[PDB]
Design a protein around this ligand. Structure first.
Ligand SMILES: Nc1ncnc2c1ncn2[C@@H]1O[C@H](COP(=O)(O)OP(=O)(O)NP(=O)(O)O)[C@@H](O)[C@H]1O
Ligand SMILES: [Mg+2]
Ligand SMILES: [Mg+2]
Ligand SMILES: [Mg+2]
Length: 160
């Protein structure tokens, strides 16, 4: 088939992520479990909203089914593996939420495996981005968003 995999970077319960062997700035997130079209579309849309146009695009099979996402390789080390951070990292995690929120994103999955720390730049970058939205009452979303944001901040601050 068309997309060419490099090394496996990692995986989760939804996908295996390969380097794109044809573009060193990209990764191929290939779904191992069924995703709804809306799920994938929002994931891609959010990644582009935060990282800019052309940051993410869907990968299709020859039958027109969504089978994955080709997206920017995000720089940095997983917070899951970090056991020490500089005092400046506190300002870095704050800045990340500020940036998301300024793009209209209320980051849902605020787990330590979903952000990377770029130590040279002192930047945290989110990997998989989805947003709370009204379709969840407003008051419930705010509580749930608050909880996640403060949890992730706690993870960071405790390494300082
Ligand atoms: N755009 C990216 N750039 C660099 N690494 C990535 C990128 N996307 C995913 N990864 C890596 O691939 C691993 C797995 O990604 P992913 O499929 O999103 O599973 P997960 O979110 O960590 N676990 P799960 O909650 O079960 O889906 C991550 O831990 C990252 O290391
Ligand atoms: Mg078809
Ligand atoms: Mg740990
Ligand atoms: Mg993920």
């Amino acid at each position: 088939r068309l997309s060419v995999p490099g090394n496996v970077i990692g995986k989760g319960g939804n996908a295996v992520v390969y380097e794109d062997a044809e573009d060193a700035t990209k990764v191929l997130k290939m779904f191992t479990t069924s995703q709804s079209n809306e799920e994938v579309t929002s994931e891609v849309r959010c990644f582009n909203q935060y990282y800019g146009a052309g940051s993410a695009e869907k990968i299709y099979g020859n039958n027109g089914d969504i089978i994955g996402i080709r997206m920017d390789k995000i720089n940095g080390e997983s917070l899951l593996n970090i056991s020490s951070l500089p005092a400046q990292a506190e300002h870095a995690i704050y800045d990340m939420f500020d940036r998301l929120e300024q793009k209209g994103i209320l980051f849902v999955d605020t787990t330590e495996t979903n952000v990377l720390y770029d130590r040279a730049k002192n930047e945290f970058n989110p990997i998989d981005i989805s947003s709370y939205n009204v379709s969840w009452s407003e008051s419930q979303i705010m509580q749930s968003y608050h909880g996640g944001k403060q949890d992730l901040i706690s993870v960071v601050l405790s390494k300082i």
